[PDB]
Amino acid sequence: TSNFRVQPTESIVRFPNITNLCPFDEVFNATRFASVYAWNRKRISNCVAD
């Protein structure tokens, strides 16, 4: 009639937590920005996804 599943444990939450200091704050809050033809490129990593 049907099939029985494997019941693969309980949901495991991984452990990616590190220092929460991110460069989003100083790149989102500024009095002057770059132009459309020449836009600033920043590699943002090594922190949490705010």
Partner 1 sequence: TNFTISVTTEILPVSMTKTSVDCTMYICGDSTECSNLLLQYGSFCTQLK
Question: Which residues of this chain interact with ligand NAG, rule CB under 6 A?
Answer: 15, 17-18, 25, 29
Can residue 19 be called a binding residue for partner 1 (CB under 8 A)?
no
State the binding partner of 3 from partner 1, ligand NAG, none, CB within 5 to 8 A by kind.
Answer: partner 1
The answer to the question of residue 41 lying near partner 1 (CB under 8 A) is: no
* DSSP states of the chain: ---------SPPP---------THHHHHS-S----SSS-------SS---
Contact of residue 29 among ligand NAG, partner 1, none (CB under 5-8 Å per partner type): ligand NAG
**38/6 Cα distance (integer angstroms):** 54
